[PDB]
């Protein structure tokens, strides 16, 4: 359950440390972004001499949330942080390393290199 | 004779065009006399090798008499010398061209043509919450200011410029005291009246217009403008909009006028693509020469600074590439194309290096 003006940890090797949601994409009045949803972020803290500078505006994917994601059996799967992975101008990962686990809702075609590099895929 | 349409007219033989890179301020302009003398050396050695010593040493004295009295501190971007027997013209132009010596029948006026082609005539609407001014401008200079003695304002039915905002609320008469908060609507209707005057003057001379003022002022104007497709740019960071000189405002619009000139070259890329898709675009140098020479050239698109020497004979119309430009070839084979396209009632567009490809430096939209 990510909404605008919400801070997310960065879970990839992109140089960003914390990003803030400035738009939930995919609908006129779309309120919330869960895992697998694409958001527009502004990077708030960055690592020195990194790929992403503080203050950039770019795309990210939500990879884990504190609210949690539901499964068909009815189980919920909650995390201790809200994390995101920064994306390209065509919404593709720019990551060579993924930090922490991600869920299995990233299975598809565009978030495959996020699942393969993830240490753990729940 | 110091104009494009006297140099295109005069047909001397030989007709020497010398272009010298000069500088506007000191100490950069210290190498201007040296560069002038250096160009005169190569042209003097070229004339003695091409025609004879007598012709070389009459042309050179004809230009030396002219250049003897030269300040070299009032130099513009380039010093163009157009010389012949019993005639020498000395024009300083603000364009950047590469130093060359052209000896031919013509007078190598491709940079004069390119400077005449980069000429914007526009209107400057100066908006404030207190007044409105209208300046008509040609490039970097103001043509007029539209005063009360302009005489293009004589038979007007709207308020003539300068237009005072003498609405009821500005003086306190009428009604609707401040608490109604109609200030925005009063400003919007005042700019509507200003646009009525602008349109009534535009319909008679139809130039593009630049809008100058505060952000909210020019936005209120764009809300209200009756012909908003004639606006080319808005400039919101201009200073001294009431007491300022007409030239001063024209100065502050120059960045916007050059951005519009760049947009007018990005829009020619689609014209080139339309020609290419209609199979009416020639890009080979020989092809463009033939098409321009037999009057088929509608528009010529030349990359900035593109110069090429070639062996041209119009009897057979064969443009073969040159080897050393020292064998009787035409020094500016592309300037000959430009001259022929202008001759046959065409246009020449000189496209900057980053919109036109380096490897395909010329492109002619043909008439068939």
């Amino acid at each position: 359950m990510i909404q605008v003006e919400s801070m997310l940890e960065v879970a990839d090797n992109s140089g960003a440390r914390r990003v803030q949601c400035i738009k939930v994409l995919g609908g006129s009045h779309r309120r919330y972004a869960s895992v697998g949803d694409i958001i527009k972020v502004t990077v708030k803290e960055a690592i020195p001499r990194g790929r992403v500078k503080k203050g950039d505006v770019m795309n990210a994917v939500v990879v884990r949330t504190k609210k949690g994601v539901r499964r068909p059996d009815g189980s919920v799967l909650r995390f201790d942080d809200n994390a995101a992975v920064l994306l390209n101008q065509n919404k593709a990962p720019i990551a060579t390393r993924i930090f922490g686990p991600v869920t299995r809702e990233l299975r598809g075609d565009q978030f495959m290199k996020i699942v393969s590099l993830a240490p753990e895929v729940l | 004779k110091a104009t494009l349409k006297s140099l295109r007219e005069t047909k001397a033989n030989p007709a020497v065009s010398i272009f010298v890179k000069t500088h506007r301020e000191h100490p950069a302009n210290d190498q201007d006399p040296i560069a002038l003398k250096n160009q005169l050396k190569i042209v003097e050695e070229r004339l003695t090798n091409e025609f004879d010593k007598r012709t070389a040493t009459t042309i050179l004295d004809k230009i030396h008499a002219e250049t003897k009295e030269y300040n070299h501190k009032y130099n513009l971007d380039t010093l163009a010398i157009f010389a012949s027997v019993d005639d020498v013209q000395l024009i300083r132009m603000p364009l950047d061209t590469p130093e060359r010596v052209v000896i031919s029948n013509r007078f190598a006026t491709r940079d004069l043509v390119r400077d005449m082609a980069s000429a914007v005539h526009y209107y400057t609407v100066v908006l404030t919450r207190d007044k409105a001014r209208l300046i008509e401008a040609a490039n970097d200079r103001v043509v007029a200011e539209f005063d009360t003695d302009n005489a293009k304002q004589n038979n007007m039915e709207g308020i003539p410029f300068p237009i005072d905002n003498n609405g009821l609320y500005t003086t306190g008469d009428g009604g609707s005291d401040r608490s109604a908060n109609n200030e925005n609507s009063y400003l919007k209707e005042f700019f509507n009246q200003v646009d009525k005057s602008v349109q009534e003057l535009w319909g008679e001379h139809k130039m593009p217009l630049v809008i100058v003022g505060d952000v909210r002022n020019i936005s209120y104007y764009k809300e209200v403008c009756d012909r908003p497709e004639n606006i080319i740019a808005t400039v919101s960071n201009l200073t001294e909009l009431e007491d300022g000189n007409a030239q001063r405002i024209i100065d502050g619009v120059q960045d916007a006028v050059e951005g519009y000139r760049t947009s007018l070259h990005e829009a020619a890329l689609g014209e080139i693509d339309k020609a290419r898709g209609a199979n009416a675009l020639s890009t080979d140098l020989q092809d463009v020469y033939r098409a321009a020479f037999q009057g088929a050239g509608e528009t010529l698109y030349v990359r900035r600074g593109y110069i090429q020497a070639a062996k041209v004979d119009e009897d057979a119309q064969t443009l073969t590439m040159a080897d050393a430009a020292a064998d009787g070839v035409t020094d500016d084979a592309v300037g000959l194309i430009i001259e022929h396209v202008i001759n046959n009632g065409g246009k020449a567009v000189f496209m900057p290096q980053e919109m036109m490809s380096a490897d395909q430096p010329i492109a002619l939209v043909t008439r068939y």
Binding site: - | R276, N279, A280, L281, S282, T283, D284, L285, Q286, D287, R290, T318, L319, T320, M321, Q360, Y368
Partner: protein, 386 residues
């Protein structure tokens, strides 16, 4: 095995009817199919590589090998098919009408086959059912033999078989029908040698992308189009620059090594010693001495008419368009011969070309001529000069 063949000759001489004749006769033992004339005459149009061709792709097989048979419904279609090389024909069935044999269409077709590099022509004459005489048939045979000899083809030892495609379709066992198509099949199965395989040709691989791996060296990627490359193979870099020697130290695909790089697959290959800026796209990898670079060459060029996209204006001497050789474009200056100043669109002649820098080529290589990305013609190398 597989062999590509086709019928060339004057229009109305029965090329399509004869192609149907071989189809129906090969349908004996179910090798082919009884083929309708109209279905093959209605050749589909394919606008491949910005070039539009009507071609009827007839297929059949014999106890010897399978044949890919090519038919075109017009001279322009035949010329386009030969020069764009939709399917190189290593054997051509020259269709000669028993009357009015050596027409200008056949005249230019034989020359076109010579230029494009068709190694073998088998002569078959039809409409013999319309001809009752023998000495004019012999005269036609002598004429076609002399014409073949006139353009480096054997002629004297060229097999000539005589028949009638209409009788072949009818089913008459008269010598001018089924027996005629039966021998014609025999010469097709005997006289035409089995063509060389891509993997059997000398190794060649145009370079499309140049990589570098720490600890491994320079990697150049591209589709190997002939031969095999293996670790330890001596290979040379030919093309834009002057020829450089190197040695294969590894062939890999998807970051995994291969035992060898075969023709037809997009393998990458490692080079010994060469640096990442000593090699570039456009150059080829070849067996040392297999190919040589040239800037001046003579090519059979077909100028596309406006109907194929093509070009509005004609070619002329001194025109310098871009030439595309398998991975790269290079500016070449068209050089016509004496008496050819104007080259009309829709025609095809032989021109000389001088490229701005050398390209690894040999006789038979095919290239595209374009300007602005618009194909203005096609060509095929017929001679290389230094």
């Amino acid at each position: 095995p597989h062999v590509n063949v086709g019928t060339i000759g004057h229009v109305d001489h029965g090329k399509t009817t004869l192609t149907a004749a071989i189809a129906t006769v090969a349908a004996i033992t179910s090798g082919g199919e009884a083929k309708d004339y109209a279905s093959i005459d209605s050749a589909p149009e394919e606008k491949a590589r910005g070039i539009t061709i009507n071609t009827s792709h007839v297929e059949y097989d014999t106890p010897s090998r399978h044949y890919a048979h090519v038919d075109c419904p017009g001279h322009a279609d035949y010329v386009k098919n030969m020069i764009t090389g939709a399917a190189q024909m290593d054997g051509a069935i020259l269709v000669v009408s028993a009357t009015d044999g050596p027409m200008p269409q056949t005249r230019e077709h034989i020359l076109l086959s010579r230029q494009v590099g068709v190694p073998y022509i088998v002569v078959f004459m039809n409409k013999c059912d319309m001809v009752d005489d023998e000495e004019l048939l012999e005269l036609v045979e002598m004429e076609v033999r002399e014409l073949l000899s006139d353009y480096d083809f054997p002629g004297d030892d060229t097999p000539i078989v005589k028949g009638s495609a209409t009788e072949a379709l009818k089913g008459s066992q008269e010598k001018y029908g089924q027996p005629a198509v039966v021998e014609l099949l025999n010469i097709l199965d005997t006289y035409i040698p089995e063509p060389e395989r891509d993997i059997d040709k000398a190794f060649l691989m145009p370079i499309e992308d140049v990589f570098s791996i720490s600890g491994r060296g320079t990697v150049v990627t591209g589709r190997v189009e002939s031969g095999i490359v293996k670790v330890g193979d001596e290979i040379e870099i030919v093309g834009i620059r002057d020829t450089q020697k190197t040695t294969c130290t590894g062939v890999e695909m998807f970051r995994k090594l291969l035992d060898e790089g075969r023709a037809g697959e997009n393998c990458g290959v490692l080079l010994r010693g060469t640096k990442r800026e000593d090699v570039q796209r456009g150059q080829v990898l070849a067996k040392p001495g297999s190919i040589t670079p040239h800037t001046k060459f003579d090519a059979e060029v077909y100028v596309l008419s406006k109907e194929e996209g093509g070009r509005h204006t004609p070619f002329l001497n001194g025109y310098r368009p871009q030439f595309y050789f398998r991975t790269t474009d290079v500016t070449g200056a068209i050089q016509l011969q004496d008496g050819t100043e104007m080259v009309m669109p829709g025609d095809n002649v032989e021109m000389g070309v001088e490229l701005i820098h050398p390209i690894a080529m040999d006789k038979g290589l095919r290239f595209a001529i374009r300007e602005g990305g618009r194909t203005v013609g096609a060509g095929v190398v017929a001679n290389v000069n230094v």
